[PDB]
User: Fold this.
Amino acid sequence: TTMDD
Amino acid sequence: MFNTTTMDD
Amino acid sequence: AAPIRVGFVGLNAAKGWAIKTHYPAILQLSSQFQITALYSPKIETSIATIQRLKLSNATAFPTLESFASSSTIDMIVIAIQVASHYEVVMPLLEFSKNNPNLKYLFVEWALACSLDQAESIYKAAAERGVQTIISLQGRKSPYILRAKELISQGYIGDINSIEIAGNGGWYGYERPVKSPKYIYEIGNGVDLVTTTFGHTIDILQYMTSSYFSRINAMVFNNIPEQELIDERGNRLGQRVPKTVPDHLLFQGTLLNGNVPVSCSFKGGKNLVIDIHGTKRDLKLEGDAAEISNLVLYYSDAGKEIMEVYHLRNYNAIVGNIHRLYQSISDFHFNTKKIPELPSQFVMQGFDFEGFPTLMDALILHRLIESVYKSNMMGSTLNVSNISHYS
Amino acid sequence: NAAPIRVGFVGLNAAKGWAIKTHYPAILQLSSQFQITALYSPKIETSIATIQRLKLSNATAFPTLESFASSSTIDMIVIAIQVASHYEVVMPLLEFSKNNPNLKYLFVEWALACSLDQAESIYKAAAERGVQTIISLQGRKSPYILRAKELISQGYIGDINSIEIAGNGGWYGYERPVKSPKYIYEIGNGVDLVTTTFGHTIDILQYMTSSYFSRINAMVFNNIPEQELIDERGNRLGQRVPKTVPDHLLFQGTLLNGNVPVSCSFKGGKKNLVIDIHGTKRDLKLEGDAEISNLVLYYSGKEIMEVYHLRNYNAIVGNIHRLYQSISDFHFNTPSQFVMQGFDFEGFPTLMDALILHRLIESVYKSNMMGSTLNVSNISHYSL
Ligand SMILES: NC(=O)c1ccc[n+]([C@@H]2O[C@H](COP(=O)([O-])OP(=O)(O)OC[C@H]3O[C@@H](n4cnc5c(N)ncnc54)[C@H](O)[C@@H]3O)[C@@H](O)[C@H]2O)c1
Ligand SMILES: NC(=O)c1ccc[n+]([C@@H]2O[C@H](COP(=O)([O-])OP(=O)(O)OC[C@H]3O[C@@H](n4cnc5c(N)ncnc54)[C@H](O)[C@@H]3O)[C@@H](O)[C@H]2O)c1
Assistant:
């Protein structure tokens, strides 16, 4: 997911 | 029991 | 009077953090925010983005130089990979002297890949005289604010102790063959300590209105090789190196009250923050930016009381950035009308109103550094002076 | 040899104490295997009083440590007195005991002594005397500790990824019973949050996981220097007393086997205990309300939780009972003696096991003072 950055 | 039982040693 | 003109570096309609969070916010708050400027290394993407989002006021600049100089911008937002923050913001700040209208600089967390870079950035930001904003959106969660309120009002009494258990992302035994390689190599500004623990330890300090005095940390890489996986969730019989940590042990003391704090962070129930007070215990929990649940307990003839605070359908991920933007707007447009307020503040600190700034981020980076420093040197560090000046 | 182990007691008192509630009930149940032949108190009247209240038809009330320790009517001596008096009583006793060719076992309560120094001296002397030793780390005999130890050792939970521990311990919080010994609240008297609550717990942890620590770091607190006295009703008497023993302990470390991360927090208050062991295949949780009551197993479009709970098992007397059992089995069916139990299932904890523990406890305090992480991976082989 894009939240893992 | 809100006392100092013998286990508290 | 008029809306805030926003210049974006890192806004991309195809992918990224800013499209999922920052944009939806700016969309809702059209009366107060307007995107006037995009910059990408590739101008085609900036343009593509302006059309997909029908940004009727957006200008796609070709260069950092041109972008940073434009006077059509009141606030710049940086939402790119942490490893590129320093290389992009230091120049940008120089160029930005050609814009008399620039008022705000908004940067995503983390600030930089190192305390050094973070210091330079903060220094430069000050020299530029703009108001700064870091993206520690946890400070705007409804749960965090209620907790902070309850605590600061004496509802749990004096804080006796605190325990934190945490889970971090893709730093377990497995990795999506999807996710990049830059996330899993140390020094690129994204990891268990800097990110998961950064955000969490910050809201902790913020809820309890205290910094640490002493801390000790052990950092682990017990999983140097990870198992790749597909979208089904199945292992592809393939291994990849990982130099970022898979476990963090942290203990320390808060200045206010010398409160003991025990913390454990794992790489694989997302989050539990247990605050034990003299009158009440308070607990915050998470699953799957959440934090999604707040619980308070009280104690011939005894009574027990449980208070649960839960917003039924709340999307923390977009919810918190929203409130961060809203908080910037309420500051700009002075919605609570206090004519007696200056145009700028160094830091938020433990204040309810306002927003986290680069100074707040700096202090945090200082705490992160000290963590790593503690681990290598294998010693307990006195960190109570972090947070003195700049 | 078909003869009952003849037991000499120092600290058995029918009116009060730990040994009457635990040791005696055990020896009572196991009459076929244990017999009390000798008591010693500083006051001979109490020894005698005890022999009559308990109708100890075989007990002789000795007047002096000298006489007691010398008597050859004794196979096992049990020491169950305040920790602060262990060293002063056992060092002499051991010397005198050379006049008893029948002495085989020396059984001492935890903690061993008030300091690592005293504990070393005691262990040294115990060795020189050549008896088999036994320390009272009875958690090593809990049914729950053993089940968990088995599951873990049989690979039922996989590799241990990490461990968390949360404990509450004793009257070390904001309040203290008005009828309560002053000494247990003054540091250096062998009874406190670290030495006792944490001692027992960290031991069973090492025992369940069959591993010692390599590195550790500890912060110890006295954030509550003055305590509020209370009555039996549980109400405050508007009176405050000094307390120099700790009210909080933070502990983190790594296990040698697998370099497993261990996070621990101990509080002074009054949910007793949670030990969370996270394995690669399953989670294992031990709970209590500091004597373990309950073992939980978690595994895995469906999730499973399994709870192991014995009913009508009194852990207080039951774990002590089980310790006498294993001593009985030992004297009767089965090396002639051992250095230590280590991580073995059979046998019992010895003074060597207690020593290693005192060494870890000393490190905990040393880490807090030095203010640094310490290497403790050698304390199971030689001096700190
Ligand atoms: N919890 C949080 O607040 C949270 C969550 C996720 C990510 N973030 C942070 O937000 C930031 C952005 O994350 P992301 O995954 O969107 O990063 P990203 O680099 O993929 O997104 C930036 C976008 O800008 C463009 N770009 C890339 N590099 C650039 C460069 N060096 N100069 C100019 N433009 C460039 C690209 O088109 C890219 O799509 C990161 O710092 C990340 O740590 C914060
Ligand atoms: N293993 C456990 O979980 C656990 C629990 C509680 C206590 N204990 C231990 O058991 C031991 C006994 O504890 P206690 O509180 O019953 O001790 P205590 O001293 O209060 O009672 C023991 C009895 O021995 C006698 N005695 C006292 N001092 C003596 C001395 N100097 N010489 C000879 N006799 C003496 C007294 O008659 C006293 O009644 C202690 O070491 C304590 O730490 C262990």
Observations:
- The domain at 141-311+358-390 of chain C is CATH 3.30.360.10 (Dihydrodipicolinate Reductase; domain 2).
- The CA atoms of residues 213 and 258 of chain C lie 8 Å apart.
